[model samples]
Target: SFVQCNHHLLYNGRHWGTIRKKAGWAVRFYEEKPGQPKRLVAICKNASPVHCNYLKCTNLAAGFSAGTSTDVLSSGTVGS
Candidate 1:
């Protein structure tokens, strides 16, 4: 049997990202301080940044979803 689950991350009361819990996927955020552009991150089972593959993310009530806009989606790796 298979069950599906979805989870979300919020920032400043806004939807930051979502996680398909049942798939062992995750979304993360980072910032040096307040009022900074939040660094949205994604990770796979190895805890390394997700690469290449097109990923979908969920945001605020509008159900916003998008993939890595540019070549690099993250500023740094998850635990580098």
Candidate 2:
């Protein structure tokens, strides 16, 4: 993966990155199964560094209380 920074900034993850991945286009960036903070993970196209209010961040801490059944039910309810 390649990152571009403003102001002539170039970095190799070893020195400048806050995140690291061995795989290109990391699956964890999408699936985010366990131990990762959904709010902090990148799960969309064309995300920006500024403004998180409408960012659609993952509600990980509330996940269990909301229940997997809710996800299924909501999925089925909203489409078709």
Candidate 3:
């Protein structure tokens, strides 16, 4: 991907980053899958819900149990 951003680097199996532009910003999350590399599963921009609350961004909701599903199922009103 292109640059012009802020990267949190990889922490554990999760990675976070933010790309910047004159218009606004886009947040990205890369999650590691078993036997595979970190994959880009989430991205948010333009006042998107995923940007507001990452948990709300459900790529695989009914299968895995993570911090995301917990908050998302509860309507994203709770805190971490």
The candidate scoring highest on lDDT is 1
Worst lDDT window (10 residues) for model 2?
Answer: 64-73
The C-alpha TM-scores of every prediction are 0.26, 0.15, 0.29
Give the lowest summed-lDDT range of ten residues in model 3.
1-10
Q: Write the per-residue lDDT of candidate 1 for residues 1-80, one digit (tens) a residue.
A: 22223333334545544444432355443333477765434332212233334444533223233233221233342211
Q: What C-alpha lDDT values do all the predictions have? A: 0.36, 0.22, 0.36
- Candidate 3 lands at a TM-score of 0.29
Model 1's number of clashes is 0
Global local distance difference test of model 1: 0.36
Clashes of each: 0, 0, 0
Model 3: lDDT equals 0.36
lDDT of 2 at 29: 25
Q: Across residues 10-63, which tens digit of lDDT does each residue of candidate 2 receive?
A: 122211112221212221222234886443233321133331111222322322
